[PDB]
């Protein structure tokens, strides 16, 4: 093998089509399916798998009571074949911790898991299924990372980490890893003011990440990373189309070097594909809660403060619950461009459905196409009454 | 392939980090998970797996009633992928018997299982998944072995066996195996007086084993084995820090060539890493029962009778149940030194929780690091009431 090099551009996105769907909650009503949260999709040279953080229990078990919590000793990063449910019997554990990220570099997979108490957390970096290196907490307030696929170029895999208050300034850093070891690190620069949970994709131009601003903005920070130079810059998406959740109603004019105000101390992980005219933004439909999901084609959204959608597609109806979303790609696929893909977490149970004591999710995943294809909502649909 | 040679030293241990955790009891509340005891971890050239002795039944089955017993026809040595539970469907049986040991020699795995009645037991030595050789009982009183990973050097794998009273003198022997066949054997020598359940690790200097003294001592025997010469010596750890369970309170001065008195006819399997200043001892926190677990950095513990801890780490709180512990290593890992690792059995159910009729365990495993990382207790946590 050889390391994956980002040499191709993105394929024109005219519409999105179904790539995968596990139906985990629906199947789990009467089978040995694990309770998970914060899913992502990531591909190796010959296989795509679903990744998620497990709660160490099945949906119908009694230890599912209280799975609403985010951090515990029982959490681990697992992976399973794409479109199969996260079962007890077909899942593989990659590493242990309550926050994680992973990516294949063209030779072997790297993964990072974060574990420990809120004021003494640490990250363990694994490569080729063995521990390689560790990073201890520096701000002593929830060390956390991307919860998505990382992108490598010629063996170098930048990873974004944050440690600090989620309701104020925090120490955001980028570490550049190669074969699990750290080559370089940088403090966050540019004009973004608060960064969490970055969704990254690569192209021949570098690595682009869309992140959450949980402190002030309804717009999203963007980190632009050059993996060869191992340098970066940052800004917000200029477009007036707001993408976080909760958010205020869309303005006529957006902001580029400052968060758009209206809803403080909250937000949801999400993504965008920024490519001039070929620019798509994902977001929820509700502005008050994490429900629905749609894709909007908003030309030059990164730089045009007055841009509005010219095309779009509904992924999830606002009648149905949504969740965290993010980007991924098959960097080993045949063709002269990369096919952009994304996933959406569909959250069921707590905190919205109080008839049950568990929280869990299903995964829906879609990829771009150059055809203008018909659309269909892809809801979860498990009937909650069957679990009562 | 080629045989593994012990050519590297140990890596400096400044702190320990989570390596694996199966959550077997927690998952097993409502899934097809086997009842096991006496776990260990062992690695092949490209994979680490959990090993344990199965009772031939699931946790929620009715045959789990009475699993408190140690020796029966139903016991077998099984292995499954690291950090997955010991399920019915993903486990592989290595061999049959109520006592066992195993290790990979760099070309193929060797395993030994002991079966038979208390007064007519025998060991069957398997290699590359086929029977190769057998050893019959010599003292006619529970032939038993290590219950951990064995260590091979250039194809030679010393194995420690004991046959005789557990409350008095016993015939302790070391057999040296190559490709499942016996090359040499020795009677135990040196100053240790009683040896059971040795936890062994290797280094460039030879093979070091820390064992249990179930007859008299609160300190532990150490066997130092030279796999090239196929010779050995023995002594006790000099340190005043006592490591068995139950134990008397720690003295100011320890003993080196004699067991430290106070608690007769009892004890627990455990381990230590002995490396001059880079010396760590594992032990329970309670002195009366098998609860809690901690690691102490006690410089020169093997030879300094007045040494005391200068650093330490809590693995399990004393509020939670613990169990047998032991050492393991990845002898095929990249780097210029070996990363020390260990595991702790977390015992649930009988004999302490009499609300249930079963006994079972979960596995927690940790590895060393050169960083000073934050600590967190790693309890089992299955709620016993869910099984009632």
């Amino acid at each position, epitope marked *: 093998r050889n390391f994956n090099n980002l040499t191709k551009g993105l394929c024109t996105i005219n519409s999105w089509h179904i790539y995968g769907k596990d139906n985990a909650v629906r199947i789990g009503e009467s089978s040995d399916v694990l309770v998970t949260r914060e899913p992502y999709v990531s591909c190796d040279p010959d296989e795509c798998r679903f990744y998620a953080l497990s709660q160490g229990t099945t949906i119908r078990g009694k230890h599912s009571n209280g799975t609403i919590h985010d951090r515990s000793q029982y959490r681990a990063l697992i992976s399973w074949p794409l479109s199969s449910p996260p079962t007890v019997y077909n899942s593989r554990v990659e590493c242990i911790g309550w926050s994680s990220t992973s990516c294949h570099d063209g030779k072997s997979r790297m993964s990072i898991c974060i574990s420990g108490p809120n004021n003494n957390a640490s990250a363990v970096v694994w490569y080729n299924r063995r521990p390689v290196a560790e990073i*201890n907490t520096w701000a002593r307030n929830i060390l956390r990372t991307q919860e998505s696929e990382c992108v490598c170029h010629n063996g170098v895999c930048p990873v974004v980490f944050t440690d600090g208050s989620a309701t104020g300034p925090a120490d955001t850093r980028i570490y550049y890893f190669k074969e699990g070891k750290i080559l370089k*690190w940088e403090s966050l620069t540019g004009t973004a003011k608060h960064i969490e949970e970055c969704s990254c994709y690569g192209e021949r131009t570098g690595i682009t990440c869309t992140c959450r601003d949980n402190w002030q903005g309804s717009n999203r920070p963007v980190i632009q990373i050059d993996p060869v130079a191992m340098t970066h810059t940052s800004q917000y998406i200029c477009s007036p189309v707001l993408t976080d959740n909760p958010r205020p109603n869309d303005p006529n004019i957006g902001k580029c070097n400052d968060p758009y105000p209206g809803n403080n101390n909250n937000g949801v992980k999400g993504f965008s594909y920024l490519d001039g005219a070929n620019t798509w933004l994902g977001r929820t439909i509700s502005t008050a809660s994490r429900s629905g999901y749609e894709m909007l084609k908003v030309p030059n959204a990164l730089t045009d403060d007055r841009s509005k959608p010219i095309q779009g597609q509904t992924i999830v109806l606002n009648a149905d619950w949504s969740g965290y979303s993010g980007s991924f790609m098959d960097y080993w696929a045949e063709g002269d461009c990369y096919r952009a893909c994304f996933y959406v977490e569909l959250i069921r149970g707590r905190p919205k459905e109080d008839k049950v004591w568990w929280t869990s999710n299903s995964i829906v995943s879609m990829c771009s196409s150059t055809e203008f294809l018909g659309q269909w909502n892809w809801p979860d649909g498990a009937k909650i009454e069957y679990f009562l | 392939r080629n045989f593994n040679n012990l050519t590297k030293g140990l890596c400096t241990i400044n702190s320990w980090h989570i390596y694996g955790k199966d959550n077997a009891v927690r998952i097993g509340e409502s899934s097809d998970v086997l009842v096991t005891r006496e776990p260990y971890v062992s690695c092949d050239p490209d994979e680490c797996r959990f090993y344990a002795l199965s009772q031939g039944t699931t946790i929620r089955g009715k045959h789990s009633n009475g699993t408190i017993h140690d020796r029966s026809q139903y016991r077998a040595l099984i292995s499954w992928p690291l950090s997955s539970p010991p399920t019915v469907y993903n486990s592989r049986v290595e061999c049959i018997g109520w006592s066992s040991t195993s290790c990979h020699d760099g070309k193929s795995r060797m395993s030994i299982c002991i079966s038979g009645p208390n007064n007519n037991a025998s060991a069957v030595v398997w290699y590359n998944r086929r029977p190769v050789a057998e050893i019959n009982t010599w003292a006619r009183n529970i032939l038993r072995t290590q219950e951990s990973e064995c260590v091979c050097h250039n194809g030679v794998c010393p194995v420690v066996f004991t046959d005789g009273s557990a409350t008095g003198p016993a015939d302790t022997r070391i057999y040296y195996f190559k490709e499942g066949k016996i090359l040499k054997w020795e009677s135990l020598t040196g100053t240790a007086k009683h040896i059971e359940e040795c936890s062994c690790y290797g280094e460039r200097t030879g093979i070091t084993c820390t064992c249990r003294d179930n007859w008299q001592g609160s300190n532990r025997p150490v066997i130092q084995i030279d796999p090239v010469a196929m010779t050995h010596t023995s002594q006790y750890i000099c340190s005043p820090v006592l490591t068995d369970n139950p134990r008397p309170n720690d003295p100011n001065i320890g003993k080196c060539n004699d067991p430290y008195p106070g608690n007769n006819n009892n004890g627990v399997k455990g381990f230590s890493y002995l490396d001059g200043a880079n010396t760590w001892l594992g032990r329970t926190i309670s002195t009366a029962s098998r609860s809690g677990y901690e690691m102490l950095k006690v410089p020169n513990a093997l030879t300094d009778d007045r040494s005391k801890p200068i650093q330490g780490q809590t693995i399990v709180l004393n509020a939670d149940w613990s169990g047998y512990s032991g050492s393991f290593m990845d002898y095929w890992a990249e780097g210029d030194c070996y990363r020390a690792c260990f595991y702790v059995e977390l015992i649930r159910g009988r004999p302490k929780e009499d609300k249930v009729w079963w006994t079972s365990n979960s596995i927690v495993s940790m590895c060393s690091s050169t*960083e*000073f990382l934050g600590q967190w207790n790693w309890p089992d946590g299955a709620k016993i009431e869910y099984f009632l």
Partner: nanobody
Amino acid sequence: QVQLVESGGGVVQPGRSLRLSCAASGFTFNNYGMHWVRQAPGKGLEWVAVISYDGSNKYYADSVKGRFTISRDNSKNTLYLQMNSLRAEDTAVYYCAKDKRFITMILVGPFDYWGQGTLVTV
């Protein structure tokens, strides 16, 4: 090659403060932690303080604890020592030194490179 250049020395009447600094070059400042060491004339070396590569961990010798502050500005490749309430016992040549270890939180030395030192008289 690696150079560390001390400045800010001088004479401080007792009870007054003084701020020292070192200009670092020839290596990436951000990859190594740094130490201050002082030597009173006619005496051996005394360790004063250490700071981690990202400024997150700061430790002091008991003899200056509560009086001295160590800090670093990674954008200027500059190490600082803020000495408050100086006493006659603090007269010494103060030196900067570079910790040999790369991007680690293990503040153990060795001191790979030393500067030339600057004298503080109290």
